[PDB]
Ligand binder design. Structure first.
Ligand SMILES: CC(C)(Oc1ccc(Cl)cc1)C(=O)O
Ligand SMILES: CC(C)(Oc1ccc(Cl)cc1)C(=O)O
Lengths: 14, 271
């Protein structure tokens, strides 16, 4: 589900 | 009654909200009432004023391949950029909610995927009145009637948001209410595909509990304000479901209306 939401995933980790 | 740990949860949610959202209700109402300044926002009410406003945005429009698209496509390219910014702010806001960052990363994505546009349309009410909405960080005001005047289907995008906003604004919420409301929207145990539903439901219960006690104290005469907001949460899920359907229709029948990549992954496989 994180492969399908790369940008969201990046902002969340940031 | 409201114990110390509950007051603290409400305070850090309110502070996270004031830190992360450039535009909020107190600032928007000052602009819309025009009681702090005789220099009102530039009004976009027809094609000519749109094109005047776009002379200012030229370098940004030419940044993408947008300056020569149809007006409908240019308008909602700028609305998308606003959405992207708000999603970015909402992501920071969520990570400041106690317990959100502890969740599995998959669950953080799911909560934001399904939550952000419910939060977006709730907070959009702050910058709307019956005649239009503030744009460009409060410097512009685009009229409701101009948006209704666009061609199908672009004229159908915003009017249901105005409809929600007029009823939502009649509740007279302030920023302290809205921050808790938005936090309740994000920490929703219902979302499709959530893994640790028990633990998220727990988290939501505490926030919704603080919301209820805060509302009873902040709006004591509006006895059923909490039930009204529960209903507004249901209305937002339906508002967003229909918005997603319209976005899908536009994405299939409109060759020139590209979706920003961040919004693309939000909408993909949504409803
Ligand atoms: C509110 C907004 C801008 O609505 C639209 C409308 C048209 C398209 Cl193509 C994409 C999105 C959004 O979802 O961010
Ligand atoms: C004024 C309008 C309708 O929308 C926006 C939205 C956000 C920004 Cl930052 C700039 C413009 C436009 O220029 O087409």
């Amino acid at each position: 589900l994180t492969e399908r939401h790369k940008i969201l995933h990046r902002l969340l980790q940031e | 009654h409201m114990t110390a740990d509950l007051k603290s949860l409400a305070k850090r949610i309110y502070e996270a909200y004031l830190k992360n959202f450039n535009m909020n209700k107190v600032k928007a109402r000052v602009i819309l009432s025009g009681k702090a300044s005789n220099n009102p926002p530039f009004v976009i009410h027809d094609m000519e004023t749109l094109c005047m406003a776009e002379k200012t945005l030229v370098a940004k429009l030419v940044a993408n391949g947008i300056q020569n698209k149809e007006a409908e496509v240019r308008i909602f390219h700028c609305c998308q950029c606003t959405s992207v910014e708000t999603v970015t702010e909402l992501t920071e806001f969520a990570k400041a909610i106690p317990g959100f960052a502890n969740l599995d990363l998959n669950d953080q994505v799911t909560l934001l995927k399904y939550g952000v546009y419910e939060a977006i349309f709730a907070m959009l009410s702050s910058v709307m009145n019956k005649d239009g909405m503030l744009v460009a960080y409060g410097n512009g005001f685009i009229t409701r009637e101009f948006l209704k005047s666009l061609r199908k289907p672009f004229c159908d995008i915003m009017e249901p948001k105005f409809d929600f906003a007029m009823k939502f604004n009649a509740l007279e919420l302030d920023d302290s209410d809205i921050s808790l409301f938005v936090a309740a929207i994000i920490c929703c145990g219902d979302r499709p595909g959530l893994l640790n539903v028990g633990h998220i439901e727990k988290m939501q219960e505490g926030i919704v509990h603080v919301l209820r006690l805060h509302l009873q104290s902040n709006h004591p005469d509006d006895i059923f304000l909490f039930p009204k907001l529960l209903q507004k949460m249901a209305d937002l899920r339906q508002l967003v479901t229909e918005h997603a359907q319209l976005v899908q229709i536009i994405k299939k029948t409109e060759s020139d209306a590209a979706l920003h990549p961040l919004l693309q992954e939000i909408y993909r496989d949504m409803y």
